[PDB]
Amino acid sequence: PVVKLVNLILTDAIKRKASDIHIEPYERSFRVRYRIDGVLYEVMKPPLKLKNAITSRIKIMAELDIAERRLPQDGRIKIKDMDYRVSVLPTLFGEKVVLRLLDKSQLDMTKLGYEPDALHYFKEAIHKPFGMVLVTGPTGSGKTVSLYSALGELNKTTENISTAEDPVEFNFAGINQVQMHEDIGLNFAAALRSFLRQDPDIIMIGEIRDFETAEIAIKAALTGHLVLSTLHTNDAPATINRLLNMGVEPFLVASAVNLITAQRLARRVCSECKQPEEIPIQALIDAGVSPDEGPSYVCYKGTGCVKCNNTGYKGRVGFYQVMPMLEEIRELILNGANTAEIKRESMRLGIKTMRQSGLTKLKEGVTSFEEVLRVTVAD
Amino acid sequence: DAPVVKLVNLILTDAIKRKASDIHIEPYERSFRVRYRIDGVLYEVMKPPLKLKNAITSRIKIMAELDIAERRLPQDGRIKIKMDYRVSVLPTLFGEKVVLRLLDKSNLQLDMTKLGYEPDALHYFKEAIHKPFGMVLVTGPTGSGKTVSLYSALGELNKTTENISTAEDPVEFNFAGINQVQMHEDIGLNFAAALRSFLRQDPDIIMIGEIRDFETAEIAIKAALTGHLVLSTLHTNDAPATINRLLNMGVEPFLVASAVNLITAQRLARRVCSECKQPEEIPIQALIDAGVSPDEGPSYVCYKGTGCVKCNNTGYKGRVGFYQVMPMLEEIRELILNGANTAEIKRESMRLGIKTMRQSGLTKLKEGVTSFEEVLRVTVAD
Amino acid sequence: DAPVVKLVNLILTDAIKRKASDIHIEPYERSFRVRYRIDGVLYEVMKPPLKLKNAITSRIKIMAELDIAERRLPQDGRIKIKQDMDYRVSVLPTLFGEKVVLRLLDKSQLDMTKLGYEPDALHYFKEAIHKPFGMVLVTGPTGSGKTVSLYSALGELNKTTENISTAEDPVEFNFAGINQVQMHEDIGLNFAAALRSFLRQDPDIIMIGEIRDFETAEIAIKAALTGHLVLSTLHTNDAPATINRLLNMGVEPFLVASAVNLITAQRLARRVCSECKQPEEIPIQALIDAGVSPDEGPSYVCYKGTGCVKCNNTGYKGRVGFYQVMPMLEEIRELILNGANTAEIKRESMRLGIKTMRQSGLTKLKEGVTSFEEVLRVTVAD
Ligand SMILES: Nc1ncnc2c1ncn2[C@@H]1O[C@H](COP(=O)(O)OP(=O)(O)NP(=O)(O)O)[C@@H](O)[C@H]1O
Ligand SMILES: Nc1ncnc2c1ncn2[C@@H]1O[C@H](COP(=O)(O)OP(=O)(O)NP(=O)(O)O)[C@@H](O)[C@H]1O
Ligand SMILES: Nc1ncnc2c1ncn2[C@@H]1O[C@H](COP(=O)(O)OP(=O)(O)O)[C@@H](O)[C@H]1O
Ligand SMILES: [Mg+2]
Ligand SMILES: [Zn+2]
Ligand SMILES: [Zn+2]
Ligand SMILES: [Zn+2]
Known part of the structure; x- marks a missing residue:
């Protein structure tokens, strides 16, 4: 009843x-x-x-x-469904x-808003024959879409792709998708062990939450499989500290992980009512804009129209931090560097933070200055 | 027994x-x-x-x-x-x-036009709470009538088309149609945990009892930027100083200028008893020191109650509000984005006709509803 | 027998x-x-x-x-x-x-004038505890007189118009009119639980025995900013160091800058016996090394007791407090928000005339209350 x-x-x-x-x-x-x-x-x-x-x-x-x-x-x-x-x-x-x-109804990677450098590192990492790719971010940050978008580029009849999801977000033909059931005993750890006996090529784990799952995932990456997963971490540098605090030895993180991303979803300014707003150049510089680039910025903001429910925004943009496990970063992990030292070293090698990725899209006129300050922290 | x-x-x-x-x-x-x-x-x-x-x-x-x-x-x-x-x-x-x-709902007065706001101040407060999104801050210490101002605003917004959620410590009065949460921080239910829960509750209007730290201030400010109306309180010295408080908490200056629609400051003074009301010989120089113009000084008739049975022999019966209603005018916003301090923001608000709490108190003194000692106790000179 | x-x-x-x-x-x-x-x-x-x-x-x-x-x-x-x-x-x-x-454990002073505060320090302390809100922190090692100073402040505030509630461990003296709660941790009655209950008890003035962890510190400092007067203690070694101690515990800087009215540091030093006292020939240069100005050096008359039956043959009878009373002046607030260290805060407080404990000890030495050896024993040089 x-x-x-x-x-x-x-x-x-x-x-x-x-x-x-x-x-x-x-x-x-x-x-x-x-x-x-x-x-x-x-x-x-x-x-x-x-x-x-x-x-x-x-x-x-x-x-x-x-x-x-x-x-x-x-x-x-x-x-x-x-x-x-x-x-x-x-x-x-x-x-x-x-x-x-939840309205499920673009799995295409070229339409997700990755900058060319970021898209290059991302494609390079998922096309390696093995290693680990970690896509991090909070709830509703687009992590799952990024993962499924990566699986789309990799889904070929020549490779065996198996996923352990909780739950399975989308049904993918050709992908062997397993849904978790803990009360019965089917958790990420149990699925990973069975995957190792399934002649796998690419493995996707819904999320690394505990050391038992990280242990098998790291081992599977070092064994010769491509392992993709997610974590809820502040940025890509802090993801390393999370794995270490879970108990994974630093040399295993240095050699197993190919790539760590961090992303946030910001709103895109409405293309119909957007127009420049007056922002003092010192405010932009305080937010991370270099003094030389400062004068060339035009910060757009929608005034509100009928095509955007008078919100000034229609659609969303991605702010991505795509950090490849560069050799300089590998040595820092082996030397026990903290999160701050790893982030600064990544910025020296040209790896844009999420703040800098947001300032780039602000420069392109597709997001507002308040969105950059809302979803990203300063560097 | x-x-x-x-x-x-x-x-x-x-x-x-x-x-x-x-x-x-x-x-x-x-x-x-x-x-x-x-x-x-x-x-x-x-x-x-x-x-x-x-x-x-x-x-x-x-x-x-x-x-x-x-x-x-x-x-x-x-x-x-x-x-x-x-x-x-x-x-x-x-x-x-x-x-x-x-807790007598019957005694509670929820019509906004009967709270004591001057008509120009009442117009700006009503305009702020009827905007589709943004933040409205009612500032003052606890016991200054802030919750009544908030409850009055929520009653004006309590329609069946909107979802209103509040986080209170504690909930003073309960209202049908309003989803109210009482904080229980001993078990982990603080303002931040309830705010993050509100964001998953498909909200339209959010009321927070008090913004006490950077974590809650950040969730509150950014909810006001994403299409939600946010009502909350802080304890600051006046409305202009609420800007400096948020900056000191850690909120970005541009987000303060973008998210806040209006800040009010209020204090509760006691209302002179109408039956034992008698003129009090306050010296003219004391009025000038408090802020009265020297040409108005002699015309002031200050009153105070001698005490009677109707007022519990206190000389007072009821309370009056000293209000300062500061809309987020474009002139003030430009001051924020250029790092202006509290003193120059206060001067700019007075330049544009925003009365201070001392000026609002002196008006109530001239009308004979409050006493001279109540004005000096709850307000500071400009 | x-x-x-x-x-x-x-x-x-x-x-x-x-x-x-x-x-x-x-x-x-x-x-x-x-x-x-x-x-x-x-x-x-x-x-x-x-x-x-x-x-x-x-x-x-x-x-x-x-x-x-x-x-x-x-x-x-x-x-x-x-008589017990x-x-x-x-x-x-x-x-x-x-x-x-x-x-x-003997109750047998209540008066603040008999504790050793200089007139300037006494004025700062009295105005801080008479404000309607804010936090007053009394700091010092065990046995430095913190409880006596707080009981003395509560006595001056013990009025029928105010609600005073204290959380003590244990309660050391019973005052009529003050609602004193004794801590019983084994049953769950600790400082945090007592403080949370006070906030539901319509409070005006709250006294917390000591702040021994971050959880209690955050509740207490936020309750003061909400709009209550809060008295408590910390085990720190001077007034500027208390600022950084709160920050290092995790208290957000704006809370320290805006919610704290005043911080005191104190030590107890023995008084020269009035019966015993004889002048002691301390070289004027030695006085200068202790922090006395060159102009005042030659004028100093230092006393030391030879020992008599009234003072147990020690030369000292009773004690007096050396107080550093630092109100949260605007200049100090700017330093908290700008990240200054203890030495900068100390130098700035001295610049504005806040006497350190060593200087307060030298003042008692000039007045003949204490000896030169006692000033060097209980205070550090600046
Ligand atoms: N690059 C993008 N640009 C704009 N919107 C996106 C993008 N990627 C994903 N989204 C949207 O994000 C929504 C779902 O986000 P999702 O990827 O499920 O978050 P999540 O990180 O998986 N949360 P959780 O699974 O709880 O950790 C979808 O409705 C998409 O429309
Ligand atoms: N200003 C003063 N002058 C002289 N004697 C004092 C003064 N203040 C306190 N005393 C006495 O010195 C002793 C100090 O004890 P008390 O004031 O309880 O120290 P306390 O700081 O509370 N120590 P604790 O509670 O262990 O951290 C008491 O017995 C007082 O009688
Ligand atoms: N404008 C007013 N006129 C008369 N009484 C008021 C007014 N505002 C508040 N009060 C009374 O004062 C009491 C305290 O107000 P409240 O808002 O609950 O405290 P706080 O300002 O700390 O939230 C309320 O119970 C209310 O009845
Ligand atoms: Mg004590
Ligand atoms: Zn539009
Ligand atoms: Zn009367
Ligand atoms: Zn003697």
Whole structure:
């Protein structure tokens, strides 16, 4: 009965073109709201007796902790396919649940916004016969799209590609995709060991979270396989310190990793209402613009039009830090250099930081100065 | 049983008739007293028998559904009497001290036009909260009416088309349609954790109780840049100094100029009792020193209450707000981006007609609603 | 009636007569002695026969309700003697017997004028604690007078119009009107939990016994900026070093610059006995090396006590405080935000006239309150 009601809330939202579902308890009421074309509408008022059953069911569908009701929790629901991003939030009179429709509908690497130098290092690293490629960033930074874009360039009938994902974001023909199931025993570590017995060529791990997974992944890269994975780290230099703090010996990181990227997703200025805004040149220089390049900058910002919902932005751009494991960086790891020394050395060799990549796209007029300062830290 | 039940109920009802905000039930080694906070000042209203020390505090526990067996640890609950009270139990060395916070929605005034804003200031505040995105900061110390200003703004925005989420420490009043979160930092639910959760909750309007550090300030500023309306508070000396506070926290100057729509500063002064109101012979030179023009000085008629039954013999009844409403004008924005300090931002705001809190206090002094000592206590000279 | 019973009573009462703070009963291989700590310095007061060491120790443990059967482990307890004197008893198992330490706990000044503050330092301290918000930090090593200074500040602020709440470990003196909470960590009542409960108790003034970790420091400094007056202590060695200690713990710089009203550093130095005192011929050059200006050098008259029965033949009777009272002046705030080190902060405070502890000691030397040897013993050179 309650399962039927929850399924109706989900199936009614896809029929009514809703992008978000809001299940909200209050002291004297309990309502469900759909966001349709940016506007919330009350679409249902279930009785107050059912609010515990409806919330628990959704938390079970999202594999969340039903015993904990005081802390925020975030999960995911897949229905057939429609995928929901679940967010639980402890209010005064119960838990509020928000489900956000994920619109899956460009896997092409040449259209992701990599600068030519960055795209060169990235393509060079994934076409090596073995080694590790790490794509880092926070949630919603485009990591998975970058990984799948790399798998597209590599997917040939001549190579065996196997992935361990939690969950499988997209179904790829020719790619052997395994979905994780921890309660049964199918985690990243178990899949990696089986992959080594599967005559593999390219291995993709959804994320390196623990030393047990890093150990097998590093070993697989040194054995002669190409290993791609992700981590949640601040930048590419800090990714090295993360692996070391997990217990991986420094010489194994120096020799196994081909390449580490760090990326953030910024908004692209609306091409219809963009126009220059007056920014003192000293502000640009304080943000990392060299004094010589300063005067040549034209910082664009959308004023807000109908083609962008009066936001001034339409679309997104990528700010990439593509750091190859250059020999200078390898020696620094072997000498136990800290994150600061590794970042400075990478900048000396021409590896642009995410801040510098953002200033480049600001120079090209495709993003605003506030976006650069919002998603990147200073160097 | 009944003598204590009657006494405890009398403690709760006399607080309502005196219009007190809080009740303090405090045991000591050789005494026992009850204090009401009336218009921000505590007063001794009762010295009950010390034999009833444990009986009185235990009765309120039962009303608050708290643990009578535990008397060594702090406890917190709520009471509804057929008027709501928030209860806080503190274990001192001579018994449990109980504090009760009166929460009457009926007494709360939420219409923005009845909060005491001057019409030009009210226009800029309303314009700021009805913009689709940006940040609005209401500054002042705790107990300066900031939450009422925020609740008034949220009530003006509480439509079924928007999702409003608040993070409060604690939640003073609850409103239908508004998703409110009470902070519980002992278990990890601080302002930052609730802010990052709000960003995954598909928000439209976000209210934060106070911005206390760089981490929360960064999430708040950047949420105001990504299409959300952000309402929050800080404790600063005035509206112009709120700019320097954010910069010192670590926020980039360009993001402050881009994200903030408006900053207000406010203080709560006590309102002179209308019945015992009498003219006070404040020397003209004292008024000129406070900021009154010398040509206006002799015309000023300062008032103060002599004390009567209607005002609990305090001379005051109610509160008035001294407001400074500073919109993020383009002139002020250009000052921020050129590294201007607090003094030159304050001069620029006064140049453009933005009244300071001292000027707002002196206006209320001229109208006879507040006293000369209240103006000097809560405001500084310009 | 028994010999040892009378002897133990003599040791306990003689300490009260001599104004001792601590009693040390120490057995060694070939000797046995009793030492009193008088004005912070230990003196041998008795040499009882070593044969009696087990009877004296056993007798004290009976009065302290300690276990006489156990002689290999440390034990702790209390003793109350009848007008009452309390003793905190600590037993320690040395190689040649059990050592016993007794700590006298006597309430028997409250007045700030009798503690040793110079008029300028007193003015800065009084205006800082009378502000409606901010943090006041009293720093110094153990036994430097921090609790007395805070109790003295609370006494000047103890009004019926304000709510004062303290978290102490332990509570050392009971004040009517002040809500004092004693820490009990084993049940979860620590400084952090008590401070969080105070914030739900409608506070005005909060006193935290000591800041011993970053978690408590952040809560306390943020509560002060929210709009409360907060008093606490740290174990640092001067006022400028307290600034960097807070920063090194992880407190954000804007919090230190904007939320701290004032920081004090202090040491206790012994006073020359008024009965004993005689002038001491200190070479004028030696005074100059200690930090006295050349103009003032020849005018100094330094005194030293020869020793009399009234001062226990030490030349010193009582103690006085050397205070460095540093208000958070605007010049100092700019240094916190610009990353200055302790030496820069110290040089700048001296430039603005903030007297160091050494200079305060030299002031007491000129006035004949303390001796030249005491200034060099308890203060470092600048
Ligand atoms: N280069 C890009 N430019 C613009 N948008 C992008 C880009 N790459 C990905 N996106 C968008 O990012 C969204 C999904 O981001 P995603 O790659 O899932 O983040 P993520 O890093 O995988 N988060 P998580 O899986 O929780 O670690 C998609 O809807 C894409 O439209
Ligand atoms: N200004 C003063 N002049 C003379 N004597 C003082 C002064 N201040 C305190 N004392 C005495 O010296 C002793 C100092 O103890 P107290 O003030 O508790 O030190 P404290 O800093 O609290 N030590 P601790 O709590 O262990 O860090 C007390 O017994 C006071 O009676
Ligand atoms: N403009 C006003 N006029 C009269 N009373 C007010 C006004 N603003 C606030 N108050 C009262 O003062 C009390 C304290 O205000 P509140 O906003 O809760 O404190 P803070 O400013 O610390 O958030 C409230 O309970 C409210 O009833
Ligand atoms: Mg102490
Ligand atoms: Zn547009
Ligand atoms: Zn009256
Ligand atoms: Zn003497």
